Design a protein around this nucleic acid. Structure first.
Lengths: 74, 15, 108, 144, 63, 130, 159, 177
RNA sequence: AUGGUGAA
RNA sequence: GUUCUUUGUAAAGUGCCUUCGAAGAGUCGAGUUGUUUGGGAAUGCAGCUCUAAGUGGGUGGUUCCAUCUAAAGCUAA
RNA sequence: GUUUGACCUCAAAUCAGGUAGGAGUACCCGCUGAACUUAUAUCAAUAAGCGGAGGAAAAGAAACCAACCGGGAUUGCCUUAGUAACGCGAGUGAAGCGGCAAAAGCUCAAAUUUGAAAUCUGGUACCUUCGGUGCCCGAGUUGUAAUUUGGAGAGGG
């Protein structure tokens, strides 16, 4: 590899700001509601159905969990 | 559906 | 049905075009300098054929930069990599011979 | 006697594999139909989301060949295949009791294909029959 | 392939079929290796049909 | 062709052109030395061989120092602005040759140039002066 | 209704604070085309026959202002509340809050443009100020903070 | 650069802010005609990367097309036909509706002297680039033609018509092979 | 079949 | 060739040392309904429910490796 | 200030500077598209019709081909080959590698010029007029001027 590159933390900062300002999509809202009430076992199925890729569903679930942790723990 | 925004990212200033 | 009745005509036209290019390009040899490349696909893994252009590493080893090399009629390939250190040596020797055999006129 | 299986396939399905997967899905109501998968431990993790202790994954490599994977997600072994909701009937050859590998594959086929009498999409009656037999170091099966 | 590991794993893969009634199983005495003309498949199809019929005759009256 | 028949019948007159001969006849116009030595009777490859200049670097497809010295014969054959010179004069008769001190000269060194650039410019100015 | 990010604007500064901010900004009007041209011609004429400090001006370019922010160089940022492509300015308040740079929302982009000799200025920010107005700049920053962050602490809430 | 923030924000098209903006802008557009002049694009981040320049000679148009030939290609053809003197450069999606889909199209006026004297954009003035959308030379047109490098487009690498001529032509030489 | 013409 | 102009602390190229170092979203993809091929992985194209990440993604052969960096455009032979 | 002016939008001018219609159509680029003819296959992604330019048009410098000691834009011929593949009958039917002809690579988006929108359209007076200078006005800061496209690239010594 010669051009894979890294985030440099600028893309990270911009993406975090965009995630905070934009809010949560209705499907994202349902996913977080299921996580906070049902759990991963129920949220991952919905994520896969909405997306169709298991890896993408797992990544979205992890992102939602991180957002919930950053929000409720402050 | 309608809830206030949260400052989880904006709570801490960028030093 | 298509019949190539202009085979001789096509050859004559190509020869005339080459002659016109030579007249317009008197000192240069009507083309650039190409490297030596080994063909893939096993069946041709033992065959050496002319390539498109020298790699950046080959040009750098030859003692000149790619930007200047292109102006001296040296083909430079920016996507070809070097992996076997015998074709690289052959290309370096060819580039050195070309540099020794070239005479460059001044701008003015 | 009850078991749940998972059905998946590689990317790219048109003339033959499409029908060979649709008929299998129709014949296996207990199986779960899911979209295409990318080529390999994610299959077992996916199986945990449906309580299905079985996976039927089809892989099409070499640009011409077809491969099938049958394995137990949690802790069982795996076997690769290369052979080219009415209740069915399955019969098996005596050769499956000779060697440990033949017995293992026979048991895996039994408990991965035989639809349990009770399931969320089962039927009470039978409509067709099928046979399992090993010859020329390979298994021959057809829907008839 | 090794029989030791395969044999050990086979135990955890076998369900208790014989410990319960065969009705739930809903599942012959021939190796089928004697079949000739393995290329035309005329005899192979007949052998498969005979095996299927033998299984059906055994699993029929149980209903 | 209806248009061709009308044009032939019409008295306007065809815009006759003749350039077939000039297609074969090509004049070399990229070098004075070669032009005085080029032989149109011989082919391009033949002329190149006669003059000693290579025609194709690669191996030609199919089967197959008299004048080169002339090119080698011809082969062997800046200033500072007034404002820049004045500024260098101020640098000189304000610090002299201490480039380190000149580097911190706020009044004269309006542009914070490096010591190397200042010394090079001073040497260039000196070469053209005392 | 509108999401919390929308309606964050229109909660501009009061009359007195906005008037004071515009009065302060009017002391740093960037030289127009004519002024710069005449200054350059005068300099050329002086050079023809034969050391100024850094000029002070208000930075207003949207890209330029955004570049100034996230580097903590900017001190005050003015944001227009009538930007037709709202997406160009939705992120500015939150970005400023994250970076800690004081910011305010003013009424009308044309008002910002007037103080910078432009038809419409999306944003107007100050980076460096003269020592004379440094105390005034700090006082205006404190007043803006008190009147915006505390008075409109709910601007980021209640849709 | 503010363009990065806008590009990142545009990704979350399902967000509350963008969800509200979609309905507001679609309601605003429905009042206007099918094709109308746009003072400036509503998605500068996409336009700038799509060759848009904030200078005289660049025209941005908004066109409405009924939801189900690709919709983008149809919109490009519709805008080009009305604006014959203009040249279509590219287009992008901006909004959608249950009954209509909205796309923003960028056009360049080759007649303007600014474009003619601009080396980076004077190439469009060539007559060969007349009605690019009609011949499917745009980004959407090329995509609809399946012109790409890879085995995925080997059978349609150079169009679906020249192949018939290539395969149906019996090549004969002076000396038969 | 395609493209057009006329018509108490 | 002949020349008249050059202009200014102006521009460009190479090696070394230091500090930084940004890549195209209703887009890929999945799903579904039609078209295309003699194309077995309908690839490709067409309507639409859905719709992602940046040590990421696509294309492949093997339990790892090989190549490239799509969603922008120009170019005579 | 019960008032003026700006920003934005919408309209009018027999105002100034500009362009598209159509014809032609052998070749090209897209939409659309049947039957005779032969046992979904096949005539056939053909005939006709529709829209768009040229002397050629499209494509063109890889999210390529390959599993080799790796090749390195597109394009056309031979070859691969009547092979792979499909239909498994009738028949349809490619592509890598190899040789030849010609070979040129580049232009934007993306990180602040901010110690100076330095950019450009248009009007006017001149001149050395396919244009140049001075002035004026406007476009532009919701981005025109320098550099860079990973083959990197940028700030300093």
């Amino acid at each position: 590899s010669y051009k894979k590159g890294a985030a440099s933390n600028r893309t990270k900062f911009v993406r975090s700001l965009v995630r905070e300002i934009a809010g949560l999509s209705p499907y994202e809202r349902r996913l977080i509601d299921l996580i906070r009430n049902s759990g991963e076992k129920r949220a991952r199925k919905v994520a896969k159905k909405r997306l169709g890729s298991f890896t993408r569903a797992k990544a979205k679930v992890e992102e939602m969990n991180n957002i919930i942790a950053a929000s409720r723990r402050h | 559906p309608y809830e206030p925004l949260i400052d989880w990212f904006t709570r801490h200033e960028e030093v | 049905v298509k019949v190539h009745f202009d085979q001789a005509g096509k050859k004559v036209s190509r020869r005339n075009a080459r002659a016109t290019r030579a007249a317009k390009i008197a000192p240069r040899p009507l083309d650039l300098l190409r490297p030596v490349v080994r063909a893939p696909t096993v069946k041709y893994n033992r065959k050496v054929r002319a390539g498109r252009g020298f790699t950046l590493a080959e040009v750098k080893a030859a003692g000149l930069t790619a930007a200047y090399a292109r102006t001296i009629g040296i083909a430079v390939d920016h996507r070809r990599q070097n992996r076997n250190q015998e074709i690289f040596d052959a290309n370096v020797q060819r580039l050195k011979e070309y540099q020794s055999k070239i005479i460059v006129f001044p701008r003015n | 006697n009850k078991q749940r299986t998972l059905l998946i396939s590689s990317r790219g399905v048109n003339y033959r594999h499409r029908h060979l997967i649709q008929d299998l899905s129709g014949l296996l109501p207990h199986s779960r139909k899911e979209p295409k998968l990318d080529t390999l431990q994610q299959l077992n993790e996916i199986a945990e989301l449906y309580n299905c202790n079985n996976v039927l994954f089809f892989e099409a490599r070499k640009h011409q060949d077809l491969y099938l994977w049958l394995s137990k997600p949690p802790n069982g072994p795996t076997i690769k295949f290369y052979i080219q909701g009415s209740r069915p009937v399955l019969s098996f050859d005596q050769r499956f009791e000779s060697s440990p590998h033949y017995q293992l594959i026979k048991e895996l086929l039994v408990h991965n294909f035989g639809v349990p009498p009770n399931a969320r999409k089962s039927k009470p009656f039978i409509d067709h029959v099928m046979s399992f037999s090993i010859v020329d170091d390979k298994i021959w099966v057809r829907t008839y | 392939n090794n029989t030791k590991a395969m044999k050990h794993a086979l135990e955890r893969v076998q369900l208790p079929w014989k410990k319960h009634s065969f009705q739930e199983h809903q599942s012959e005495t021939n190796t089928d290796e004697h079949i000739k003309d393995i290329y035309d498949d005329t005899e192979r199809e007949l052998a498969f049909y005979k095996q299927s019929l033998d299984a059906v005759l055994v699993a029929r009256d149980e209903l | 062709s209806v248009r061709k028949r009308k044009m032939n019948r019409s008295s306007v007159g065809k815009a006759t052109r003749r350039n077939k001969d000039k297609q074969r006849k090509i004049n070399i116009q990229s070098n004075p030395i070669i032009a005085a030595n080029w032989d149109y009777s011989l082919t391009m490859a033949q002329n190149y061989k006669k003059l000693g200049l290579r025609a194709k670097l690669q191996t030609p497809a199919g089967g197959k120092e008299t004048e080169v010295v002339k090119k080698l014969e011809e082969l062997a054959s800046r200033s500072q602005s007034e404002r820049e010179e004045e500024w260098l004069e101020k640098l000189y008769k304000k610090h002299g040759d201490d480039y380190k001190k000149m580097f911190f000269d706020k009044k004269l060194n309006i542009y914070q140039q490096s010591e190397g650039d200042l010394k090079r410019r001073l040497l260039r100015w000196k070469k053209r002066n005392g | 209704k509108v999401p919390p990010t929308i309606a964050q604007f229109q909660y501009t500064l009061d009359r007195n604070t906005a008037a004071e901010t515009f009065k302060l900004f009017n002391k740093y009007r960037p030289e127009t085309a004519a002024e710069k041209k005449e200054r350059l011609t005068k300099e050329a004429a002086a050079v023809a026959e034969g050391a100024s400090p850094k000029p002070y001006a208000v930075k207003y370019g949207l890209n330029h202002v955004v570049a100034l922010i996230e580097n903590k160089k900017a001190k005050l940022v003015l944001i227009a509340n009538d930007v037709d492509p709202i997406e160009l300015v939705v992120f500015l308040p939150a970005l400023c809050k994250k970076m800690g740079v004081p910011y305010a929302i003013v009424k009308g982009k044309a008002r910002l443009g007037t103080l910078v000799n432009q038809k419409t200025s999306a944003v107007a920010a100050l980076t460096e100020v003269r020592a004379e107005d440094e105390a005034a700049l700090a006082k205006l920053v404190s007043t803006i903070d008190a009147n915006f962050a505390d008075k409109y602490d709910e601007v980021k809430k209640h849709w | 650069g503010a363009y990065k923030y806008l590009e990142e924000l545009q990704r979350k098209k399902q967000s509350d802010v963008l969800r509200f903006l979609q309905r507001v802008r679609v309601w605003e557009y429905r009042q206007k005609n099918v094709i109308h002049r746009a003072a400036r694009p509503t998605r500068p981040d996409k336009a700038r990367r799509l060759g848009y320049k904030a200078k005289q000679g660049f025209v941005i148009y908004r066109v409405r097309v009924r939801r189900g030939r690709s919709l983008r290609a149809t919109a490009e053809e519709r805008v080009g036909r009305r604006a014959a003197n203009l040249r279509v450069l590219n287009s992008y999606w901006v909004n959608q509706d249950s009954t209509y889909k909205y796309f923003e199209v960028i056009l360049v006026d080759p007649q303007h002297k600014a474009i003619r004297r601009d080396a980076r954009y004077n190439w469009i003035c060539d007559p060969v680039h007349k009605h690019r959308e009609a011949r499917g030379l745009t980004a959407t047109g090329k995509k609809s033609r399946g012109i790409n490098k890879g085995h995925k487009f080997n059978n349609t690498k150079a169009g679906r018509r020249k192949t018939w001529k290539r395969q149906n032509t019996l090549s004969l030489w002076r000396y038969r092979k």
